[PDB]
Amino acid sequence: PGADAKTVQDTVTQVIEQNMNGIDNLMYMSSNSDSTGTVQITLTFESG
Amino acid sequence: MPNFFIDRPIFAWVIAIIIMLAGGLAILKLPVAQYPTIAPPAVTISASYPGADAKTVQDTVTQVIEQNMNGIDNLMYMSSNSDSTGTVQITLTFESGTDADIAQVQVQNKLQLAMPLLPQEVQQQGVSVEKSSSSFLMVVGVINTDGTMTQEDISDYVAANMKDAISRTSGVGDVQLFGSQYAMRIWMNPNELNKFQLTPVDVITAIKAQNAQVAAGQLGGTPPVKGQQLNASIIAQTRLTSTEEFGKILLKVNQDGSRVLLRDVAKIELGGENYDIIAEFNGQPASGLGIKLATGANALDTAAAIRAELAKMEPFFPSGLKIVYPYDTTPFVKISIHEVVKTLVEAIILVFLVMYLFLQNFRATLIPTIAVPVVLLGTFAVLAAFGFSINTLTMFGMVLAIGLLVDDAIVVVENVERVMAEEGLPPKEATRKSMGQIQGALVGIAMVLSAVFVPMAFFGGSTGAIYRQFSITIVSAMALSVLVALILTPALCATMLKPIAKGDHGEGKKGFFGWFNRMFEKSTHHYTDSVGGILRSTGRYLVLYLIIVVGMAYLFVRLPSSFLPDEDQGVFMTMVQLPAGATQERTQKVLNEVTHYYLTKEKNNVESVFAVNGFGFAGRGQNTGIAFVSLKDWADRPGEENKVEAITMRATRAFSQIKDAMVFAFNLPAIVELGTATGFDFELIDQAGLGHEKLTQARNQLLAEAAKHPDMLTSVRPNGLEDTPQFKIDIDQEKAQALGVSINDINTTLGAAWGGSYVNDFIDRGRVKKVYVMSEAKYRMLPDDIGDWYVRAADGQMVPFSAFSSSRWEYGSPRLERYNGLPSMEILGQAAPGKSTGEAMELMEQLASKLPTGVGYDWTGMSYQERLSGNQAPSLYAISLIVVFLCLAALYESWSIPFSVMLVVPLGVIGALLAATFRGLTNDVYFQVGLLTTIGLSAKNAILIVEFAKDLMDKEGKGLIEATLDAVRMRLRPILMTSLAFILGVMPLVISTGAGSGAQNAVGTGVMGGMVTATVLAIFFVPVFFVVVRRRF
Amino acid sequence: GSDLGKKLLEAARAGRDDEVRILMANGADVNAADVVGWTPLHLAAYWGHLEIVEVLLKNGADVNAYDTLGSTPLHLAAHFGHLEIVEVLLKNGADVNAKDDNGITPLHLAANRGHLEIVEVLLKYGADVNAQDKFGKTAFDISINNGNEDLAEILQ
């Protein structure tokens, strides 16, 4: 709450992403960090 | 079926082709790893409590977490350590077969609900729940060679510019930093603090206020006034980003208007999150990354990918930075694979040579050359379908199956060649008659072999997991081999073999082969003549048999058991233990001495020494260290003298000299989790709230008694740490209250200064990092320093700690252990020579029965399994024995004839024992799986001899002796052919030295020794078995 | 501080009587001290090893050795309830009124832990009932603060 995109990204988004390593069947990951301090990270997995 | 395919060679080729394609696909997509997963799943909870002692950690964190580990599925046991580095680790170990992900999430969810019960400073540090592993793919070291970077500078570089790219690298499952990214370090000076009537409490308060993210809002935010033209975010206070900004933090304004800044009472710098480890690589500051393979990944690809990533980071390195590779399993693993392919190819070449030598045509020589690779390829396919990997175990499983595969090929082809020479039957009709003689047996053989190997897949725990790898590999290979023998080989024989005139045994051939043929034709007659005489004297051979059986029993009982042999893996370890209470500086001097020895007196062999000061396995602290030694490549270390075992012995020898430090070197185990055979792992438990001191006395009592039984027990010892002096300080509540000094201020002043305190976070070049306050070193070294710290009373007066405290020395534990939620002390030891671990354990239990009231015990780790997944080996061999008997009985339509095949078992076993005993080897898994294949093959030989003999009796009305003589006459050649090929083929493994030679020797020697006696003994004994069993019944 | 000094410290702490005997025969320094200033006698007194205490005193141990915070073996014996060690030390010249750096005496410590018999022995040997620690407290103050009625009587 109250944080800008850049601050959210440096303190939250990148922190979570650097731990999303070596998960099984991960195809790709995308995220966004916005001006409402909201972060969403989506991990998409191999079919099946 | 073979008749079906004999008229449909093309359908048989189709089947062969599908199998080869499946196999080729599997070999491309199969995962590669040194070892498959073997230890039961384990989850570790880890927490730090900065400045805390073991009891504080135990009583405010460990007990609380343990008390919440309920309602989690498939838990076998739980254990924990709480120690004076301010650390706790709780390990929960689950039943084999448990889904590790589910285990981990269930633990993590129970922890989540306990977090509010934990101290603030622990909630703030966070508590990690991880899956336990001990195997790294590799360790990448990062060093600075120009003296411009400390280990802390390096670690931050690695964290900021390398770690994340490595983590994203293909096939990497996890990466661990050796060190931390920077922390903002505030080093307080109590003299300045007091000069301005400030305390660490004020420092902390100021940092919290002046280094923070503050929410504001929006201009023209909803709901707005209509007509509003602009909507924009408002940005207010954001976190500090530099040492300079922290230095300028305002602490106080004096009357004269002067300003007290944080830099006026502290030194401020980027430093480490902690300072307990000192890492050096050949005396140079070091950090690094421990890297683990992701599930299902390919070790070799991943290693190459990691190096590719490192390579493209190089151009951007600061001056002096360099990558090193002290540990990488990949080169070792490449060799294993090359050595195994080499073995399989040579085997096929030997079979080729032997076929040609005996059969003397290239067409016959082609058939096994085709059939064996088809079986192998198909085995890969089935392994891939079973979810297996290409690993050390599955690869040797294959070479252990070589005899069996080679034999199926040789048997079918040789028998067709014999039928043609004996009857002048055309190849196609010969093949029909031949398969007719052997097909039933081949099926019976497939059942018998399954009965022998499958049960091994049913052992429990870790050993079962290892046996399973051989079991399924060998059974799959064996099954494919029989299928190919019933489908492909007969069709090949019928279409590729040229006719042989009736009676032509090549005796009239010119040159070397006519000679061989004549030589061998008459050796067969000597052979039969000899069996003839033997069969007039069966009584004495029964006597010789009982002697063989007895010598087997004898040899077996005296052959020491182990798990997997040590290897020169190109690295090994040296432990450094100084007396309790020894300082980091003292430990460093020893490590330096150790390092100096290696780079000096082992300069020809040693590439590097990675000295980690402050790190232990059974304890951390300033008095423990490890020297991780990396060796030059095997090729530059010729001779037993320049191999790990030797180097290790010399090293330890040399370090026995070192004054007040236990220092020794040892090779690495193939798989840490197995411990040692002979080894046990014992837990003494406080069952009645006895407390630490009474538990200690009970422990000592037990250790003294154990030592009185050197005949049974050896090296029975504590796995943990002895109590040590600690400095007890009592706050006087009354005096503090009278002086108007708060306990909070007293306690954070003491803890912050002497133990350090994690205040909050800042942002360093874009990355979030920690801020720590603590006293500069020289003000927290000695008891006298305590009184140089002042606390501000309510009236503004500064009060020295000496005014409201008193102190004394006492003893306390630097590491408290718990087992299943109760105070405990782990005890390690091993059975004495010639003693079973079961015997050692039985005694330990006896000794434990005599300990003070309220003291219990339990077995954990390898002993926990033993007490369980080790009470199966005779029930499984009994089923095996019974099923084999049943299959044989159906094969021969007789309840007695099966005995004549089963009597063959000891014949190969005696030779395997002899070779192992003489070569100074042990009864390990390779030895054991080899016994099974050796037994399997001799059983197969006997089955065919008996089948032929019986058929001659049933069908041609032939006498018992007549039939036996003719059968053994017909079986001699194919039996010799197989033994020659297989024996020559395993010989390289026997004499091999260097990388992987440990495993190679273990597989080869037992096999070669078993095959020798099985071959030589069986050709004389199974006719005896058959004749005596028949007469009896 | 010597090979044998170190071993003597260990053996005394562990209560290994035989080892100590041999070490005494070999001249192991009875006055060896570790970092915090504890002698083998300190160790033996703390861990309650009576025989070792007696052997040490026969071999010229300093009965009034003090550690880096001024605490003696009698302090330790009295604090941890080792009655007969306390008696032996006092028989052998232990200063019944020794004050550590906090001005704390063996009496304060026995009182604090409610060791009545030890308190009586100490008084027997001339323990100063009116001695005050750095905070002005006596053993009697300690006993009423602890609510130990019996000990408070003994100390009238």
Ligand SMILES: COc1cccc2c1C(=O)c1c(O)c3c(c(O)c1C2=O)C[C@@](O)(C(=O)CO)C[C@@H]3O[C@H]1C[C@H](N)[C@H](O)[C@H](C)O1
């Ligand atoms: C820096 O210095 C090093 C230099 C070379 C090797 C080493 C290290 C090192 O620090 C190190 C470790 O800190 C740890 C381990 C280790 O192997 C090394 C080195 O080899 C293994 C581990 O499982 C244990 O020792 C537990 O008993 C975890 C432990 O670390 C901590 C931190 C982990 N990330 C994890 O969260 C948990 C808290 O264990």
Ligand SMILES: CCCCCCCCCCCCO[C@@H]1O[C@H](CO)[C@@H](O[C@H]2O[C@H](CO)[C@@H](O)[C@H](O)[C@H]2O)[C@H](O)[C@H]1O
């Ligand atoms: C491929 C590997 C080949 C290498 C094998 C090397 C040979 C070593 C073992 C050979 C054993 C054969 O030994 C065999 O024993 C029997 C008796 O028991 C002998 O038979 C003779 O002696 C016995 C008793 O003394 C008589 O009952 C018998 O009538 C008589 O003919 C055979 O003449 C002899 O050949």
Ligand SMILES: CCCCCCCCCCCCO[C@@H]1O[C@H](CO)[C@@H](O[C@H]2O[C@H](CO)[C@@H](O)[C@H](O)[C@H]2O)[C@H](O)[C@H]1O
């Ligand atoms: C033709 C194809 C091949 C067929 C192969 C058949 C293999 C099937 C494996 C079944 C056995 C599994 O392992 C299982 O171990 C436990 C003991 O821990 C046994 O339980 C039993 O065995 C133990 C022996 O150690 C005895 O104390 C007692 O008879 C009982 O406890 C089970 O009876 C057994 O089934």
Ligand SMILES: CCCCCCCCCCCCO[C@H]1O[C@H](CO)[C@@H](O[C@H]2O[C@H](CO)[C@@H](O)[C@H](O)[C@H]2O)[C@H](O)[C@H]1O
């Ligand atoms: C990056 C490298 C990771 C490897 C980590 C290895 C884990 C083992 C460390 C803890 C054990 C500490 O001490 C212990 O270590 C060795 C086991 O590994 C033991 O060594 C034991 O196993 C060795 C290897 O198979 C054998 O060569 C020894 O004969 C045997 O004694 C030591 O006798 C023991 O003192």
Ligand SMILES: CCCCCCCCCCCC
């Ligand atoms: C003519 C008789 C054919 C005999 C087939 C024997 C098959 C043995 C199978 C063993 C099954 C357990």
Ligand SMILES: CCCCCCCCCC
């Ligand atoms: C990999 C392709 C092998 C196919 C060989 C087929 C030979 C057919 C001969 C009749």
Ligand SMILES: CCCCCC
């Ligand atoms: C990656 C290819 C490996 C082949 C091993 C059989």
